[PDB]
Scaffold this active site. Structure first.
Site, PDB file in Angstrom:
ATOM      1  N   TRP A 136       0.848  -1.191   0.000  1.00  0.00           N
ATOM      2  CA  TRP A 136       0.000   0.000   0.000  1.00  0.00           C
ATOM      3  C   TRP A 136       0.871   1.224   0.000  1.00  0.00           C
ATOM      4  O   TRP A 136       1.490   1.552   1.006  1.00  0.00           O
ATOM      5  CB  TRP A 136      -1.047   0.105   1.129  1.00  0.00           C
ATOM      6  CG  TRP A 136      -1.906   1.347   0.968  1.00  0.00           C
ATOM      7  CD1 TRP A 136      -1.513   2.645   1.155  1.00  0.00           C
ATOM      8  CD2 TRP A 136      -3.277   1.408   0.526  1.00  0.00           C
ATOM      9  NE1 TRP A 136      -2.551   3.505   0.884  1.00  0.00           N
ATOM     10  CE2 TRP A 136      -3.645   2.775   0.496  1.00  0.00           C
ATOM     11  CE3 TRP A 136      -4.230   0.441   0.169  1.00  0.00           C
ATOM     12  CZ2 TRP A 136      -4.927   3.198   0.112  1.00  0.00           C
ATOM     13  CZ3 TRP A 136      -5.498   0.861  -0.207  1.00  0.00           C
ATOM     14  CH2 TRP A 136      -5.834   2.227  -0.238  1.00  0.00           C
ATOM     15  N   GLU A 208       7.537  -1.524   1.943  1.00  0.00           N
ATOM     16  CA  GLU A 208       7.292  -1.064   3.306  1.00  0.00           C
ATOM     17  C   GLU A 208       8.106  -2.084   4.201  1.00  0.00           C
ATOM     18  O   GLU A 208       8.086  -3.298   3.945  1.00  0.00           O
ATOM     19  CB  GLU A 208       5.804  -1.233   3.681  1.00  0.00           C
ATOM     20  CG  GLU A 208       4.797  -0.324   2.966  1.00  0.00           C
ATOM     21  CD  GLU A 208       3.402  -0.918   2.978  1.00  0.00           C
ATOM     22  OE1 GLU A 208       3.039  -1.639   2.045  1.00  0.00           O
ATOM     23  OE2 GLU A 208       2.687  -0.683   4.010  1.00  0.00           O
ATOM     24  N   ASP A 241       9.455   2.775   1.882  1.00  0.00           N
ATOM     25  CA  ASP A 241       8.316   3.608   2.263  1.00  0.00           C
ATOM     26  C   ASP A 241       8.109   3.479   3.757  1.00  0.00           C
ATOM     27  O   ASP A 241       7.545   2.498   4.235  1.00  0.00           O
ATOM     28  CB  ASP A 241       7.035   3.155   1.513  1.00  0.00           C
ATOM     29  CG  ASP A 241       5.803   3.996   1.859  1.00  0.00           C
ATOM     30  OD1 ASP A 241       5.880   4.869   2.719  1.00  0.00           O
ATOM     31  OD2 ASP A 241       4.722   3.760   1.195  1.00  0.00           O
ATOM     32  N   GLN A 244       4.413   4.552   7.671  1.00  0.00           N
ATOM     33  CA  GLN A 244       3.864   4.098   8.935  1.00  0.00           C
ATOM     34  C   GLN A 244       4.896   3.724   9.968  1.00  0.00           C
ATOM     35  O   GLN A 244       4.641   3.803  11.162  1.00  0.00           O
ATOM     36  CB  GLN A 244       2.905   2.937   8.714  1.00  0.00           C
ATOM     37  CG  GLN A 244       1.653   3.423   7.987  1.00  0.00           C
ATOM     38  CD  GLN A 244       0.440   2.559   8.222  1.00  0.00           C
ATOM     39  OE1 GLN A 244       0.309   1.896   9.265  1.00  0.00           O
ATOM     40  NE2 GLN A 244      -0.460   2.547   7.246  1.00  0.00           N
ATOM     41  N   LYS A 270       3.037  10.281   7.080  1.00  0.00           N
ATOM     42  CA  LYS A 270       2.072  10.311   8.186  1.00  0.00           C
ATOM     43  C   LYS A 270       2.636  10.785   9.526  1.00  0.00           C
ATOM     44  O   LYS A 270       2.265  11.841  10.033  1.00  0.00           O
ATOM     45  CB  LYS A 270       1.430   8.945   8.378  1.00  0.00           C
ATOM     46  CG  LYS A 270       1.007   8.224   7.110  1.00  0.00           C
ATOM     47  CD  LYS A 270       0.428   6.855   7.476  1.00  0.00           C
ATOM     48  CE  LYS A 270      -0.401   6.241   6.364  1.00  0.00           C
ATOM     49  NZ  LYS A 270      -1.806   6.059   6.783  1.00  0.00           N
ATOM     50  N   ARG A 404      -5.120  -3.601  13.333  1.00  0.00           N
ATOM     51  CA  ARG A 404      -3.900  -2.826  13.242  1.00  0.00           C
ATOM     52  C   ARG A 404      -3.892  -1.902  14.441  1.00  0.00           C
ATOM     53  O   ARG A 404      -4.697  -0.980  14.549  1.00  0.00           O
ATOM     54  CB  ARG A 404      -3.862  -2.023  11.944  1.00  0.00           C
ATOM     55  CG  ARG A 404      -3.865  -2.887  10.688  1.00  0.00           C
ATOM     56  CD  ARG A 404      -3.360  -2.110   9.485  1.00  0.00           C
ATOM     57  NE  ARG A 404      -4.343  -1.128   9.042  1.00  0.00           N
ATOM     58  CZ  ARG A 404      -4.079  -0.080   8.256  1.00  0.00           C
ATOM     59  NH1 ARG A 404      -2.853   0.164   7.810  1.00  0.00           N
ATOM     60  NH2 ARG A 404      -5.065   0.748   7.918  1.00  0.00           N
TER      61      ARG A 404
HETATM   62  C1  LIG Z   1       2.785   2.552   3.780  1.00  0.00           C
HETATM   63  C2  LIG Z   1       2.017   3.704   3.195  1.00  0.00           C
HETATM   64  N1  LIG Z   1       2.581   4.497   2.247  1.00  0.00           N
HETATM   65  C3  LIG Z   1       1.945   5.548   1.666  1.00  0.00           C
HETATM   66  C4  LIG Z   1       0.657   5.806   2.017  1.00  0.00           C
HETATM   67  C5  LIG Z   1      -0.122   6.953   1.314  1.00  0.00           C
HETATM   68  O1  LIG Z   1      -0.375   8.084   2.158  1.00  0.00           O
HETATM   69  P1  LIG Z   1      -1.526   9.160   1.808  1.00  0.00           P
HETATM   70  O2  LIG Z   1      -2.810   8.449   1.910  1.00  0.00           O
HETATM   71  O3  LIG Z   1      -1.414  10.307   2.833  1.00  0.00           O
HETATM   72  O4  LIG Z   1      -1.195   9.672   0.478  1.00  0.00           O
HETATM   73  C6  LIG Z   1      -0.039   4.995   2.947  1.00  0.00           C
HETATM   74  C7  LIG Z   1      -1.425   5.314   3.282  1.00  0.00           C
HETATM   75  N2  LIG Z   1      -2.031   4.809   4.317  1.00  0.00           N
HETATM   76  C8  LIG Z   1      -3.221   4.188   4.230  1.00  0.00           C
HETATM   77  C9  LIG Z   1      -4.083   5.138   3.704  1.00  0.00           C
HETATM   78  O5  LIG Z   1      -5.109   5.182   4.597  1.00  0.00           O
HETATM   79  N3  LIG Z   1      -4.876   4.237   5.641  1.00  0.00           N
HETATM   80  C10 LIG Z   1      -3.736   3.666   5.411  1.00  0.00           C
HETATM   81  O6  LIG Z   1      -3.412   2.776   6.278  1.00  0.00           O
HETATM   82  C11 LIG Z   1       0.679   3.959   3.543  1.00  0.00           C
HETATM   83  O7  LIG Z   1       0.176   3.095   4.443  1.00  0.00           O
END
Ligand SMILES: Cc1ncc(COP(=O)(O)O)c(CN[C@@H]2CONC2=O)c1O
Ligand SMILES: Cc1ncc(COP(=O)(O)O)c(CN[C@@H]2CONC2=O)c1O
Ligand SMILES: Cc1ncc(COP(=O)(O)O)c(CN[C@@H]2CONC2=O)c1O
Ligand SMILES: Cc1ncc(COP(=O)(O)O)c(CN[C@@H]2CONC2=O)c1O
Ligand SMILES: [K+]
Ligand SMILES: [K+]
Ligand SMILES: [K+]
Ligand SMILES: [K+]
Ligand code: NA
Ligand code: NA
Ligand code: NA
Ligand code: NA
Lengths: 431, 431, 431, 431
Positions: A136, A208, A241, A244, A270, A404
């Site tokens: 993701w 990730e 990435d 998180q 984030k 989570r």
């Molecule tokens: C690992 C990771 N990278 C990039 C992003 C993208 O970030 P933006 O949504 O701010 O562009 C997410 C989004 N996280 C998801 C999005 O919503 N919930 C999640 O767990 C993410 O989990």
């Protein structure tokens, strides 16, 4: 009450639905590890909002720098530099491993990944991107093209040169060697296939360190070092990435520090902004120089904007000063042990994994079949809420439903305990 | 001074370069229509930063709501609704034309365009996107794929199904009919070619009402109505990117109001957030319902976050209350007339175009050859700066260099005059 | 002599090189299982030319129908039908399994595959194509996009929606389950990955029953039935490329008959034309009807041309009349046993596989490491030639070099023996 | 009779439909400029079959070499050279302009185009291909991707990097400059758009000198020279598809000779094989050398097969010996004048264009509106047939229906007259 019919009416008439369902409450205020509904009921935020509020909600120090900057230096022409930007960039260079020198300050996670993938492509003259089948990375073009946990159907072809390999998943292994789950051999096997498909344009691998949306899947011992070698051998960049995982959540400043494997490009988002839109990519001086010679472009409205940058700097300061990284380990230990006790109490808990304050609980029907517990996951989540605890379950193909868990780094022992309490009650109420 | 060698050293060592050059000054504070360097020198901001600070810098009302929310409701789990979000969505429905009912609140312009293009694709079951050869929609995947003014080289193939048609440009016409520049006939001709190339998957046309990065190119009388018909006939959605034009800058709340042509999807960003990262897409109830039935997904970290939403609401309020839309016309008139006087004084000024407070000045060698004035544009820009006026020139193929002028809607008559003053001095100093 | 310097000079000056090296001889005549150089030396053709001359070279019956038609009905407007076309189409329906009813008569193998892939796409409304990582379907667009054994580098992106899965290879297994090479589990695992990558547009799986260019890899027991089920479950068509296996070479009229699994589309080429350019696709009446309703188009210059069609019909007749399919088994048995005897004599022979008259011999350094024998393969091939036997070795990644043996179905016991003789001598001369 | 119900029954049950409708007759024999049905009725073949039978049907000289080779040298392993191949390659070098030195002998037109596009891509390291919006290059992948006159819908995305520009069409002009149809200015305008879309990977432009399927559209004076310059400036190769124009049909050996513009790659097919499947690409020694260094691959079953090559050589011989190129001019003149007389007699004839023996007649409702004559075209075609003349009309968007006339180069004055006769009768019978 949460029932203002004007409110719910306007919500229904004027909001675009974008995934999931809206919680049936109206959130009026937030503070620390809690959010409060219209009746004033406090909900313990075990997900730090959308996994971002690292310092909990409305952190006084954060409230202050935001005030400080709103009234003094807000937004600027993208060619104009200011102190917070240079300070944050400098700080980022100083706290990430050697080999990460230069930063680009953006706004969202997807954007950060896009900026990184674009740089990789430019600098290699290539275009194929490899990711994990359970990843993701975001909702925008390149980011979504590298996102395999969801969102690939009904929206046209993906970016040309998109490949995925399976992610190492110890809980449910599928590649054995000598009556053994050999995840390095799996990696070798995955790569051979890529090699056979590639048009000879492998540009980067994006990953990730802990697949969050994918179900809290931690890359096992020695995997990363192995991956980085697969990349090096192919002339590919490794993009990590850490949206998180970055900024102390796993118990290290950056997850990549745990393995001692440093990526070519590191992306953050984030946690860095702590609720506000701020993101970044950090790369080596050599990569930046070449991108530059090659005319790299990533010019947006808010790149290098002072306010967010000032917020990011403050967040780094507090994390460091209050030793919140160590705290992540201490509270994580406490949280983890509690989860293990629940798993003792309840057969429906099949696994507890994760690191520091990024934990996952996999719900299962049979702790042997490890048969996925459909529906159970959802009532539990439901009772949690009534019980006053905000949880989030991710449900992926062939896996059990996963909670989570990611509370604020500033979470208290008491809060951890309350959460453990509420969770136990929700499970027994749900079976 | 602007010469802190620690500063410039850190900038050089730790910043990723992303387009252009960095201004050789350190911006310390900003207020109203001005930014101030380290020596305290005030620079008149004729571009509202990166064309966003609609209410100028550090607007007291903005400073207040930001305080108000930083300390009370900041960021939330994306499934949780709150008052600012519902209020802003409702407001947006009320002030946009009939046919635009439901909003999605995001963070950046590119994101807003991505969200819109993704919805178009979903709802049509198609994937081909048509844009203007001189467009600018963002740096992320889909947005960049629809961006033809720059950034298409050296970064791999674009999204599959990307097409561009030429934009109607009255200053330098290229399609004649009966010794006449027939831009509607050009449109017809462009479309015939598309039709012949299409794989039968035309999903949407994306357009800026006034091409800003493309050189302040206003779509001429009756064009838009014509475009919308080309779309309707092909079962395509029309997406209008009002990142630069929306929220009163052209003299109407939305540029689309001037022509009376309402798009299927409207996107907003820069102006809406007034320096802060906030963006949105507004679509009709019918389109939202179908997207929804079809499982539309655009789940990000900051979607529906209360703070930015609260900022957006305040901005709308002040614009409305202080009649800043009307003001845009009044000051625009004043600014436009001044520009015309300069063009009387100087042969190097080939054209003055635009609308309200989104104006463009095209620099030319010969006001007949309309031969592009290479280099002149740049010294002018340079002298402006020394003179204390921040300008921005965009230089595209086969066109003269263009100054994009867009001061704050709150700009004063005196400020307009100062700018006119400084600009005249810069031109004579530069020739 | 083979040394006409005018000849070799003209070859060098006027021929485009397209893969490999040219044999240093001038072939003047061909008859039966032999080709003759300029000195009149006879070379035993153990590859039936480019694996096509099923009835050997210059088969009197073939010579006759070609005469018969050259002078009476040659080429026609593609809308005009004639007897040979209808007869050949009818014959093809009668000898292929139930479920294959309608034929399209084309010219080359690649074309046949293209026609089949295009029909699959049309009828499903989808576009993603899955093949084997060691496949070979042709040099044209779609066919090459589904070809993974070679040719993917340096020629631009492949067709959008191209995926490969590993082919089941018993000699060198890589997927174990319970200390066992579980090729069905491998298949399951491969598909899960596809499913995760797919954009939801899986159209067809294309496969050779015996991967010829891939190194004579026979799909093991129950694989095909399993594959067809994976397809059915996904709403995908199964296209079987029998260019090398069709028309009696494996000991059955069609390889698909052995497994009793009937494909949705069957393609034929090399063997069908017996040296001449003729190819075909055979599909079910239901698929043809829908393709037709949908406006299927595959209009070429030689589609439905009488001459080639008349040749194809004759070939079918002789194969049937002279029971050449049975013969394939009898001679194949003889050839196979000889190969096994050589493998007894020489450690460098690691494996002998294949079926009927499509056999493969894998050269290895160590019959335990099964370490690939680089270079050995090539001298052997070289000595064979001097010895007077035309062989063909295919060398793929991580495999030993493979001799592809495929003599004419009309080959004699004596010829088989000569070949065995020459091969033994070449191996001992080469070590 | 043409009514063998067994025949028509088998046709219906066992033939895949691939475009159009089948003529309701059974063709039993063919000779010279005629085909004969089952009742023995002779049909004058004004399209040389599918525009290939350059020497008419069953040419004794052709019948002889086919016999000669069927029985002596038929098909070979693709690494084995023989005399006909080297002779044909040499001949091709000798009769094409200077700059065309090396040939590749294949089987079909599409294949020839694929081989050329693949070489262009390899040698440039690029992948984008530009063609005419009214082109026709074949049914296989790359060839179809560059084909815009038809076949682009319902079969998935086209190859990545596919662009079309409008073809210069004097009969129905759409680009004026100074009350003038400036087709060179149109060309300039088209290219500017491409340039703006390109990802910086323009590899080649592919074109027919006379668009046959597109409606007999001849590139006007100086166009080609202009096109070649656009290519040179962009580092693109120019590929000329002379499938219909090559081998004397336009009155020159090759159409490219008329303009004196020599392409980088020339492809030939239909006419070269004279009904049999033979095709080729001819390129310069420099391009071949580089392709070779780069590992160019185009290895098929019938590449360099002796029989077809021997046929091609004979065809070249007869054309040269019997001065059939000159003949094309003489008979073309006669045919053209006849057509002009008909146009005098009938208002429905809007235009007569083409060159030598590749002529087109555009049917129109109003010779002023030039309004397309729907349906008229089809009865005419219908009556022609009854009258005993095989014609072919192509109907494209926004154009009148077009008869593509291309009789054998060996056609007689009497035959030309008969055709003119039958055509006149068909038109009056049809109005
Ligand atoms: C690992 C990771 N990278 C990039 C992003 C993208 O970030 P933006 O949504 O701010 O562009 C997410 C989004 N996280 C998801 C999005 O919503 N919930 C999640 O767990 C993410 O989990
Ligand atoms: C019309 C338009 N749409 C969308 C965007 C994308 O916005 P973000 O950069 O915030 O994603 C821009 C960017 N504006 C460019 C970007 O920088 N300067 C400009 O003039 C724009 O001009
Ligand atoms: C200009 C041109 N190039 C290439 C080809 C492809 O040849 P193949 O069909 O043999 O591959 C064609 C086909 N000619 C079309 C096809 O049928 N009728 C025509 O007029 C053609 O007209
Ligand atoms: C299984 C299979 N399918 C299709 C084709 C394509 O046929 P054409 O080359 O006639 O288009 C080939 C080619 N055979 C290769 C090609 O050359 N040698 C081989 O073994 C093939 O092996
Ligand atoms: K900025
Ligand atoms: K949120
Ligand atoms: K034909
Ligand atoms: K051959
Ligand atoms: Na560092
Ligand atoms: Na509205
Ligand atoms: Na059958
Ligand atoms: Na020549």
């Amino acid at each position: 009450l949460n029932d203002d019919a004007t409110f719910w009416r306007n919500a229904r008439q004027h909001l675009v639905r974008y995934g999931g369902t809206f919680e049936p409450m109206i959130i009026e205020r937030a503070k620390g590890s809690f959010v409060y509904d219209a009746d004033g009921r406090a909900i313990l935020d075990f997900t730090s909002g959308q996994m971002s509020a690292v310092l909990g909600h409305c952190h006084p120090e954060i409230v202050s720098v935001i005030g400080e900057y709103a009234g003094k230096l807000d937004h600027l022409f993208s060619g104009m530099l200011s102190r917070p930007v240079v300070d944050l960039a400098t700080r980022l260079a100083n706290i990430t491993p050697p080999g990460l020198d230069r930063a680009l300050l953006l706004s969202t996670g997807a954007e950060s990944n896009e900026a990184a993938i674009r740089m990789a492509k430019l600098v290699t003259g290539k275009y194929e991107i490899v990711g994990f089948a359970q990843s993701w990375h975001g909702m925008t073009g390149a980011a979504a093209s590298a996102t395999y946990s969801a969102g690939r159907k009904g929206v046209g072809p993906a970016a040309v040169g998109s490949f995925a390999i399976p992610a190492p998943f110890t809980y449910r292994p599928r590649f054995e060697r000598n009556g053994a789950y050999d995840y390095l051999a799996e990696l070798d096997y995955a790569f051979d296939l890529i090699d056979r498909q590639s048009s000879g344009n492998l540009a980067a691998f994006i990953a990730e360190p802990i697949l969050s949306s994918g179900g809290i899947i931690e890359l096992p011992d020695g995997y990363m070092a192995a991956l980085k070698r697969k990349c090096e051998a192919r002339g590919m960049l490794l993009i990590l990435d850490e949206a998180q995982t970055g900024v102390g959540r796993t118990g290290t400043m950056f997850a990549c520090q745990r393995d001692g494997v440093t990526p070519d490009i590191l992306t953050l988002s984030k946690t860095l902004g702590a609720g506000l839109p701020l993101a970044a990519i950090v790369t080596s001086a050599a990569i930046e120089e070449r991108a530059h010679e090659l005319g790299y472009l990533f010019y947006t409205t808010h790149v290098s904007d002072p306010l967010p940058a000032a917020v990011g700097l403050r967040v780094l300061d507090v994390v460091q000063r209050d030793g919140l990284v160590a705290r992540a380990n201490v509270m994580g230990d406490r949280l983890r042990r509690g989860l293990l006790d629940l798993m003792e109490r309840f057969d429906c808990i099949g696994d507890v994994r994760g690191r520091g304050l990024l934990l996952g609980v996999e719900i299962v029907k049979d702790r042997r079949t490890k048969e996925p517990a459909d529906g159970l996951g959802a009532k539990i989540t439901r009772e949690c809420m009534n019980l006053g605890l905000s949880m989030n379950i991710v449900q992926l193909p062939g896996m059990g439903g996963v909670f989570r868990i990611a509370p604020p780094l500033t979470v208290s022992e008491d809060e951890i305990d309350l959460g453990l309490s509420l969770l136990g009650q929700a499970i027994e109420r749900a079976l």
